[PDB]
């Protein structure tokens, strides 16, 4: 329940410009600009979206987890382990317990599109 003063922002995600054929794994990279991430849980969900109209709407959660895979001093990655199918997707990352009450309780990635190439 203690907030460790971490502040994670989505910095990048899979670039699906043009035709990216399913299956291809999706990811997001997050930078922590706050204090070191220790015990605060930053939940994430990969949503299969109805569409990419902003602001993004909750869809079907097909994978989930917590931000944990450290790739730099202040940098983390979330990614898929299940086989992807054609559709439109985005990661939704939730503020941890005790996070300040300014702004949203979540952050979405940009939408990512996987084509049907069969």
Residue numbers in the entry: 72 to 189
Manuscript excerpt for this entry:
Bacillus subtilis expresses TasA (translocation-dependent antimicrobial spore component) as the major biofilm protein, which aided by TapA (TasA anchoring/assembly protein, YqxM) can convert into stable oligomeric structures to form the biofilm matrix.
The longer construct was investigated because NMR showed long-range contacts between W74 and the core of the Ig domain. TapA71-190 shows a V-set Ig fold (InterPro code: IPR013106) composed of two antiparallel β-sheets. D71 forms four hydrogen bonds involving residues G169, W74, and R73. The additional hydrogen bonding suggests a higher stability of TapA71-190, which is supported by the TSA data (Tm = 60 °C for TapA71-190 and 46 °C for TapA75-190). Structural integrity is supported by a disulfide bond linking C92 and C188. Intriguingly, the secondary structure pattern of the Ig domain resembles in its core (gray background) that of the TasA filament structure and the proteins of the chaperone-usher pathway. The high melting point of TapA (64 °C), together with the fact that it already consists of a complete Ig fold, explains its inability to be located within a filament.
